[PDB]
Design a protein around this ligand. Sequence first.
Ligand SMILES: [Cu+2]
Ligand SMILES: [Cu+2]
Lengths: 223, 223
Amino acid sequence: IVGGYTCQENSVPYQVSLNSGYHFCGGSLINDQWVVSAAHCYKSRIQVRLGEHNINVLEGNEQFVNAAKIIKHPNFDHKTLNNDIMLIKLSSPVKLNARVATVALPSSCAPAGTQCLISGWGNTLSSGVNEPDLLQCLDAPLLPQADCEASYPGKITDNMVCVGFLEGGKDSCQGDSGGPVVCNGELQGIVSWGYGCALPDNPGVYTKVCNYVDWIQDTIAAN
Amino acid sequence: IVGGYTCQENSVPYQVSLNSGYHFCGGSLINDQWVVSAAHCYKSRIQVRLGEHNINVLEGNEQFVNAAKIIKHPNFDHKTLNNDIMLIKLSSPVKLNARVATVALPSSCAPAGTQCLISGWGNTLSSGVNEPDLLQCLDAPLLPQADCEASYPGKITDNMVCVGFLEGGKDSCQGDSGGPVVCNGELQGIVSWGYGCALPDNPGVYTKVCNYVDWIQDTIAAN
Ligand SMILES: [Cu+2]
Ligand SMILES: [Cu+2]
């Protein structure tokens, strides 16, 4: 998160860290045994870390759990990052409590103008890399689809939505990938891509989760 | 390397990749059993990879060797990155040949105006991160110390030298760290830090190797 603020400790209780010896992506807990993330965060083995605030200090609320099935969407295409969404089933259900909780899936697609919360332990600079310890937060609105399209000519599918500020300064970045954008209580987007991080006229683009509620549900049911 | 060109295969034969399950820093081979890198690239276990061009494909000239002693300078200070230099002794001597060779240590400090070659598998973007497969190269001059000082007020010690372009566009970046700047045949600088990557008025700053020839030699002798 570039240009964001440090989240109050465990105020984003659905946020998870995907770790393979180091933090490389984020995700969201949608029920006690399943995480949703980006298909681009695929790796053969993943340890999911829940209840985190400081990614480098054990503060006493962490639950570390291995991923048992890691399921990318059938039609994920790495060249366009179209259908960038992946489901992770945990080896064991987690114990839900104040600091580790679920986020609801969307009842419908959110309109342009909605303020959303984006969080992650991703890069905090628009140039160079600085990885933060503490979870970062950003309040940002869903952009009009025609501004998304204007910023990325020919690259936006109906499964993508821009969230951010056309002025730049504030955006998600690498390492936030796979993490949540939640707009009053429901998961509406997954961190996916954008040109640079926090550049003017280059808002971040997100996987539009309302287009996948049926896929997510069938996949959970069948697994 | 931002704004650089892909080096001809094995044209930089002293360049090594420090790997701990992934590439995280560079270094230079200065004799058949020793590598010099940045103290900031310290890790408890390191595999040194020599003879590389494509960091992700085995092309047939690679030699992978573990580090036996990893020695940071006694006075390295992580807050200012002053004395950012580290020596690595390999478990076995490597076999030197056309594609794996040594770079000479400096006979003296190079003057402002010298063109140098910088190489690495570091980040190639001034905003966001993109890690390259193929080794990257950049021709860049040593800057006047007063321009270094003007760009980083109060942060430049006599053990640092700026190399780069005040206009921005071309610079080293994260992942190049610990790698070589060679100015007609001798190692004159080690990739260390800078604000951003390739920003105007923010040239890269390098560990000034001519200040450490005696330390490097005593340390090798004693180990
Ligand atoms: Cu990719
Ligand atoms: Cu550091």
